[PDB]
Design a protein around this ligand. Structure first.
Ligand SMILES: [Zn+2]
Ligand SMILES: [Zn+2]
Lengths: 234, 235
């Protein structure tokens, strides 16, 4: 089984926010995934075949037909491992407990947390206007949301270090509430109680966009790893 | 048809994981063109037009067979998307900068083939290792190095974007085999006398991870991997 990877994180860093991947094709490649949309117009999250665009106006809109993306990741989720979080557990505690239970730090995993969270902190990237700026600049004015005692789902991927720059090394997680209105890209969280489900994948298929923007992008940033830490963290 | 099929990672090779589970009987499922190595680092892999060889330090080149295994290799179905002629004497540096300027993008994957006569080719052939394995930086210190003069044959390999360094080898990664199919190896340097160039552009890379305990348990978090790849791959 595979992670289907649409373009690279370093292209997003360089301000290439317009891709040619059409979300009408999501069912060909997975029923689970995360990412963003063209122009950075919102956060993508989906699982069980149901995908949403989360925007900074506090809405979550089902994805449709000609929605496009410069960057996203999909898989067909299979429940290979399950784990229960009984009581309060912080992100640092959780992420450390899970990665100690992985068969290998050298494989790809999809991960889903379903339950109640004491806290979740998210961002939602917002629509950008041309000419685009690099992502480190673009996220400085992102909306940040703090949720308390909220029911919902955190979903995303664990990525081995050797793929950092194609994807985001380590945990990359998005959140949507049970009411399907709010969430975004996750910075931090505390679990009250949840069920964990993990899917192990032995392949990553990277698909590069057929766009002039991607062809002409400058992807030779020696500081990309620190720039990813900056854009993806609080 | 539009992918590089990538078997495991260069950083796993760096860590001394020389035994994979990829069986070369399955090469025809994934390409007719490629390079890499074999289990135990027993020789260099090269193939094109569906014909693959194991190049060893003893100056032989043996056709690959059924149960040959590899920890690291790259394949594609080669399509002649671009052609170019090198009319006269041209150094590696000349050539690599001439081709690189002609690529549609430095952000895509390419297969590349040079067929003709080379004034010089310098190669290495990694040699069979005995367990317990040492890291690749140590393993290559005693590699056989060959120098060929005015030789006819084929240089073949891949151009890899910088974002995939560590999965594969960023930039040019090229192997060589002579027309007599006996000699060659992993290319360190070369001077073209005259050759035909053919290039194939790919929009996908599919990375396949081995189902081996060795790979599962490997330490792939070497902050210095890029320099270590420089070391093992130049002269
Ligand atoms: Zn994200
Ligand atoms: Zn090589």
């Amino acid at each position: 089984s595979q992670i289907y990877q649409v373009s690279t994180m370093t292209s997003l860093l360089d301000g290439v926010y317009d891709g040619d991947f059409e979300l009408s094709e999501i069912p060909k490649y997975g029923d689970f995934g995360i990412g963003t949309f063209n122009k950075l117009d919102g956060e993508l999250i989906g699982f069980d075949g149901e995908f949403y665009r989360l925007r900074s106006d506090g809405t979550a809109t089902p994805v449709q037909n000609g929605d496009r993306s410069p960057f996203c990741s999909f898989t067909f989720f299979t429940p290979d491992m399950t784990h229960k979080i009984d009581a309060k557990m912080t992100r640092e505690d959780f992420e450390k407990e899970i990665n100690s239970m992985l068969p290998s730090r050298n494989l790809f995993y999809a991960i889903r947390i379903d339950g109640l969270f004491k806290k979740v902190q998210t961002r939602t990237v917002e629509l950008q206007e041309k000419p685009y700026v690099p992502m480190v600049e673009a996220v400085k004015t992102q909306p940040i949301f703090n949720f308390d005692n909220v029911r919902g789902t955190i979903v995303g991927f664990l990525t081995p270090a050797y793929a950092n720059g194609i994807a985001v090394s380590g945990y990359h997680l998005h959140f949507i509430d049970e009411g399907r209105n709010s969430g975004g890209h996750v910075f931090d969280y505390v679990l009250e109680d949840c069920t964990v489900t993990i899917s192990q994948k032995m392949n990553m298929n990277l698909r590069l966009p057929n766009t002039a923007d991607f062809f002409n992008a400058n992807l030779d940033n020696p500081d990309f790893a620190k720039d990813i830490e900056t854009t993806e963290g609080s």
